[PDB]
Amino acid sequence: YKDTLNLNTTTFSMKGNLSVNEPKTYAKWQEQQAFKRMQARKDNHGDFTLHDGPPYANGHLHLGHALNKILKDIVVKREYFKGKKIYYTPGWDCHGLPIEQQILERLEKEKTSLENPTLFREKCRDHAKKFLEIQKNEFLQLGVLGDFEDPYKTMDFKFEASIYRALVEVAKKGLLKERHKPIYWSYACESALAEAEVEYKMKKSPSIFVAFGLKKESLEKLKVKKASLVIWTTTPWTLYANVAIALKKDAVYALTQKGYLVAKALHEKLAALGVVDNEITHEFNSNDLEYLVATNPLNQRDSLVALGEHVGLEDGTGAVHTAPGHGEEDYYLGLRYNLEVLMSVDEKGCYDEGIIHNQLLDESYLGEHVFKAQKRIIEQLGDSLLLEQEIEHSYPHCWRTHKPVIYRATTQWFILMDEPFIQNDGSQKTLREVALDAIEKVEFVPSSGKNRLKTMIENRPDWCLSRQRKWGVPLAFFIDKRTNKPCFESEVLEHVANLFEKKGCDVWWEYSVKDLLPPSYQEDAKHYEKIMHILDVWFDSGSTFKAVLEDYHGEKGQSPSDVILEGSDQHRGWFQSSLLIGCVLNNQAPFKKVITHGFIVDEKGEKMSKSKGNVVSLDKLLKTHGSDVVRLWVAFNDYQNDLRVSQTFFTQTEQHYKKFRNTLKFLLANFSDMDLKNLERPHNFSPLDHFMLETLETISAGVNSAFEEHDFVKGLNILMAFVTNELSGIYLDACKDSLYCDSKNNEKRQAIQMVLLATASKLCYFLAPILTHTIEEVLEHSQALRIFLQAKDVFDLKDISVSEKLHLKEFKKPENFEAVLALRSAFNEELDRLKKEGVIKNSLECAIEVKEKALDENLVEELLMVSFVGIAKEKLSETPAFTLFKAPFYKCPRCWRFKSELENTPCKRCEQVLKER
């Protein structure tokens, strides 16, 4: 009788063959310009702008890039399917050391050089172009949709002009100022750096305690025979630049029997270390030591005893070796006392002629790198070296050369944080104040991200903008030699900006000063000289809101954006640079909302690097699992924290994907034969039908609410529980007899099919942002779904009203299945017990007599899948709720239910179906 059943099959395959079929889908969306079609949708209602943070145009995509673009894609697709016009122009960060360092390294490896600035910039620009195309196509292989054929590029000439015009706005508001002070200096790239370009890593260091003997006249003033202040330092390379020893104000300093002078609060620690001897002979107040003078044991130079602002007593000695050329707090102390700023370390981190001309350090050190010289310096200290250790400490390194940085007093350009400036509304505020106010108006997901960014703004220094490399946007101002000050005249600045817009920034190197000035100024061209520093690339990316959202007047999205979505490492990076520049231009953040994610890490939670051998390639991952599995893995996991890549976790995701896919296959298979005239007329739905429609509505609200708050785990868990439990476990098991053995003309079967159609419809809508290829495939294989949803393809999906499309009555009282589902669970646990004893094989062999008479007997029979409700003859078991019997019928050879009065004879329902004309 098997061939007399309803076939109930679909062409939608159980196997996804994802690595074969996904490229076909994505190629189609590119060929057909699906993102453009999305933006053009005629019934768009509302707008949604996600502003892409631009990856650097260097190298192939990392797993973190895929995580990022997939999450953006889910968020964007969610808004599209809610009915909005979407703005999502992806972009690329094309300048900076992330590109330039690769060129510098390749030149070195080729044993070649390239000193021509235009030709050098050309090699960098060609490298960004190459990898922009590579990353673009790799992004498209994730199934993401955006304006990838018209992306934004910081190397576009109009973009270079937009960045420069952002800088112009900073300068005209009085926040762009030169400062001279020690800052981060990367000797390996001969450039200043700021915080976002520094990576702190553990590093071993010498750690030394050094005695500076007081001069004879100072010992006479203090009335002791011997006294030497002891300092602690990890940088013997700066001892040549000492000008002072800074003490804590109004603090007691102990003089030992051997003549060492240290903070009394630290004497116990230092004597236990063996730095000084244990016997204290005299105590002195630091206020009485100020303006004594000591002698540097390295070079015999005077060192002033000074009082520092906040000298610490937790480490060291309480006497701080002070080198204004190499320490920012040292520098301010030096100026307060009108001391020399000694700085004889060149741009490559090597001692220069200054050590000879000023007698700071022996001539032999000329040309030596400061880190290389330290062993010989420590040996030169002789008896003044009281103790030498080796320690480990967290130390700043250059983000691209990975070499340790140093600090060098230098003249650079800064955006000031504590300089009051005129607000757009006419009030007066500092940038720090504006940025803190602006942070409070932004929504952070998770909300903990707010305090992370806030704390950085509270604590950050002035922002050094000027870099000494060639690949970037120049700080393209002239210094008037007649004034020694920059020219911020609007006519000059807009003349340069317009040149940049048309020709790009190459002209700043190529053109003469005269050719770069408005005609009104060319007679005075001899008085002007170009600043040749370039902008921090974090200023480039900080300006994307201006260059993309503002300068295209909303065609690429609104300013402020509705959402930005990046790694939580961008609090130190793009979030902060965009926040600061937004606050100068607009006095608010250029984003309304920040969503963050973690890092992709290995099975042990560790970062992937080539030096570790734990790198999983994005290509290998997509080839193994398929992009819809990778996308589901992202969505079905706690992406705000680090995501670990392991076989075990991807296997779990594949099982989820399989369950979703097998469920959609079953639904499609079991309404494939439905007559489409059913779609227009209403149906009489059973209580179980209604229970499922009501359950589907309740869980649909919960999936949607979870997805709205970007908690895709919570929503997918709700969806998966529904498909596993109420759908597959209860409804589809109860309906299989009718779906396969009732007549196609049976109105109860047709009503089940409509429920299955409504259920697949909701599954398609909710999974469309995540498994877009798979839902596209579902629609491709189901004509009934396409008619019912009025959908040509996945991009025509909308959130449908099941009530309206099935013609449900307005005030229908919901079903209450609590009692009958409690019976079902009790029956199934009693039935499990009888299968243990070998008494019966399945529920169909049973009759049940329910002790509660209020229950609907057909629904009991449906849900428990017994063949008979009522009393029979062979008792199997008894509970307080029900008695089970052997069903007093034969098994029907067609439907396998125990409903046949005669052996091997079709039951009454089957007999009619087999007879039907």
User: Among 805, 714, 818, 821, which Cα is nearest to 760's?
Assistant: 805
Q: Give whichever of 49 and 295 is closer to ligand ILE, judged by the CB atom.
A: 49
Identify which of residues 128 and 251 has a Cβ nearer to ligand ILE in the complex.
Answer: 128
Residue 610, number of CB atoms within 10 A of its CB: 7
Q: Minimum distance between the CB of residue 733 and ligand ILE, rounded to whole angstroms? A: 49
At its nearest, how many Å lie between ligand ILE and the CB of residue 125?
16
* Residue showing tokens 């300013």: 559
Sign of the Cα torsion 483, 488, 491, 492 reads positive
Give me the residue whose beta carbon is nearest to ligand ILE. 53
H-helix or E-strand containing 320? strand 319-322
Q: Smallest Cα–Cα separation from 464: which of 533, 541, 400, 530?
A: 533
What is the C-alpha to C-alpha distance for residues 455 and 435, in angstroms, rounded to an integer?
Answer: 11
Binding mask 92-121 for ligand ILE (x = CB under 6 A): -x----------------------------
Residue nearer to ligand ILE on the CB measure, 575 or 765: 575
| Closer residue to Zn ion (CB): 121 or 891 | 891
> Using the 8-state DSSP alphabet, how is residue 241 labeled?
G
Beta strands 228-233 and 260-263: pairing type? parallel
SS3 91: strand
Answer with the entry of ligand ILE, Zn ion, none that 800 interacts with (C-beta below 5 to 8 A by kind): none
**Shortest CB 562 distance to ligand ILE, Å:** 17
Residue 894 binds which one of ligand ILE, Zn ion, none, with CB within 5 to 8 A depending on kind? Zn ion
53 touches, from Zn ion, ligand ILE, none (C-beta below 5 to 8 Å by class) = ligand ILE
- Contact string (CB under 6 A) for ligand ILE, positions 551-580, x = contact: ---------------x---x--xx------
With CB under 5 A as the rule, give the number of residues binding Zn ion: 5
By CB under 5 A, is residue 850 in contact with Zn ion?
Answer: no
* CA-angle at 715, arms to 816 and 34, nearest 5°: 125
Q: How far is the CB of 753 from ligand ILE (least distance, A)?
A: 49
- Residue 267 binds to Zn ion (criterion: CB under 5 A): no
Nearer to ligand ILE, 175 or 564 (CB): 564
CA torsion sign for 553, 557, 558, 560 is negative
Phi and psi at 177, nearest 5°, equal -140, 145
Find the part of the chain contacting Zn ion (CB under 5 A) among 334-342, 520-528, 576-584, 900-908: 900-908
Q: Which residues pair with 594 in a beta bridge?
A: 444, 564
**CB distance 317 to 232 below 8 Å:** yes
What's the first-to-final CA gap in the chain, in angstroms? 17
Q: Could you give the CA distance from residue 896 to residue 63 in angstroms, rounded to a whole number?
A: 52
Helix (H, G, I), strand (E, B) or coil at 748: helix
The pair of three-digit structure tokens given for residue 461, joined into one six-digit string: 């220094």
| Element of type H or E holding 597 | strand 593-597
Return the one option of Zn ion, ligand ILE, none that residue 317 interacts with (CB less than 5 to 8 A, by type). none
Q: Which stretch binds Zn ion (CB under 5 A): 200-208, 368-376, 582-590, 906-914?
A: 906-914
Those residues whose C-beta lies under 8 Å from the C-beta of residue 207, and which sit 6 or more positions away, are 232, 233, 234, 388, 389, 390, 391
582 binds, among Zn ion, ligand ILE, none (CB under 5 to 8 A by kind): none
List the structure tokens of 692: 């499922």
Closest to 643 measured CA to CA, from 607, 617, 618, 611: 607
Residue 705 tokens, joined: 């609410």
Task: Give the 3-state secondary structure percentages of the chain, helix then strand then coil, rounded to 5.
Answer: 45, 20, 35
Task: Indicate the residue among 144 and 345 with the shorter CB distance to ligand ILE.
Answer: 144
Question: Smallest distance from the beta carbon of 218 to ligand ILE, in angstroms?
Answer: 53
Q: At what angle do helices 712-721 and 687-708 cross, to 10 degrees?
A: 170
539 binds ligand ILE (CB under 6 A): no
Q: Calculate Rg over the CA atoms of the chain.
A: 38
Q: Would you say 667 or 910 has its CB closer to Zn ion?
A: 910
Q: Does 410 bind ligand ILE (CB under 6 A)?
A: no
Rounded least distance, CB 567 to ligand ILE, Å: 7
Q: Residues 319, 289: contact at Cβ < 8 Å?
A: no
For ligand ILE, give the closer residue by CB, 10 or 541.
541
Q: Could you tell which of Zn ion, ligand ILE, none binds residue 566, using a CB distance below 5 to 8 A set by kind? A: ligand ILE
Residue from 25, 303, 541, 843 in contact with ligand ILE (CB under 6 A)? 541
Within residues 158-187, the interface with Zn ion by CB under 5 A covers none
Residue range at the interface with Zn ion (CB under 5 A); choices 183-191, 629-637, 822-830, 909-917: 909-917
| Partner touching 93 among Zn ion, ligand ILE, none, CB below 5 to 8 Å by kind | ligand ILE
> Looking at beta carbons only, is 93 or 689 nearer to ligand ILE?
93
Nearest to 275 by CA among 330, 217, 207: 207
Q: Which is nearer to Zn ion, 343 or 844 (CB)?
A: 844
Based on CB atoms, which residue is closest to ligand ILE, 58 or 772? 58
Using rule CB under 6 A, residue 598 touches ligand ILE: no
CB of 456 to ligand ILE, least distance (A): 16
Taking the least distance from each CB to ligand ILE, the nearer of 53 and 236 is: 53
Q: What gap in Å lies between CA 221 and CA 200, rounded to an integer?
A: 45
Q: What's the DSSP call for residue 369?
A: B
Residue number, 8 or 717, with CB nearest to Zn ion: 8
- Name the residue type at position 52: D
Report 26-85 residues binding ligand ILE (CB under 6 A). 53-56
CB closer to ligand ILE out of 56 and 148: 56
Q: How far apart are CA 526 and CA 512, in angstroms?
A: 10
Q: For ligand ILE, which is the closer residue by CB, 402 or 908? A: 402
Q: Which residues contact 745 (CB under 8 A, 6 or more apart)?
A: 916
Minimum distance from residue 39 beta carbon to Zn ion (Å)? 55
260 has which bridge partners? 228
Of 184, 101, 161, which Cα lies nearest the Cα of 464? 184
CA distance 711 to 713: 5
Nearest approach in angstroms of CB 49 to ligand ILE is: 16
Q: Which is nearer to Zn ion, 298 or 907 (CB)?
A: 907
Rounded least distance, CB 275 to ligand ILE, Å:
44
Residue 910 site contact among Zn ion, ligand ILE, none (CB < 5 to 8 Å, cut-off depends on kind) = Zn ion
* Interface with ligand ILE, residue 139, by CB under 6 A: no
Which does residue 324 bind out of ligand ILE, Zn ion, none, counting CB within 5 to 8 angstroms by kind? Answer: none
Burial group, residue 204, by CB count within 10 angstroms (0-12, 13-18, 19+): exposed
- In angstroms, give the least distance from the CB of 365 to ligand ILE: 39
Residue 439 near Zn ion by CB under 5 A:
no
Q: How far is the CB of 876 from Zn ion (least distance, A)?
A: 23
Among 251, 275, 343, 910, binds Zn ion (CB under 5 A): 910
Binding mask 856-895 for Zn ion (x = CB under 5 A): ------------------------------------x-xx
d(CA 133, CA 129): 6
> Distance between CA 745 and CA 763 in Å, rounded?
27
Q: Does 146 bind ligand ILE (CB under 6 A)?
A: no
Look up residue 204 and give its amino acid.
K
Q: Which residues bind ligand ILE (CB under 6 A)?
A: 53-56, 93, 541, 566, 570, 573-574
Q: Which residues bind Zn ion (CB under 5 A)?
A: 892, 894-895, 907, 910
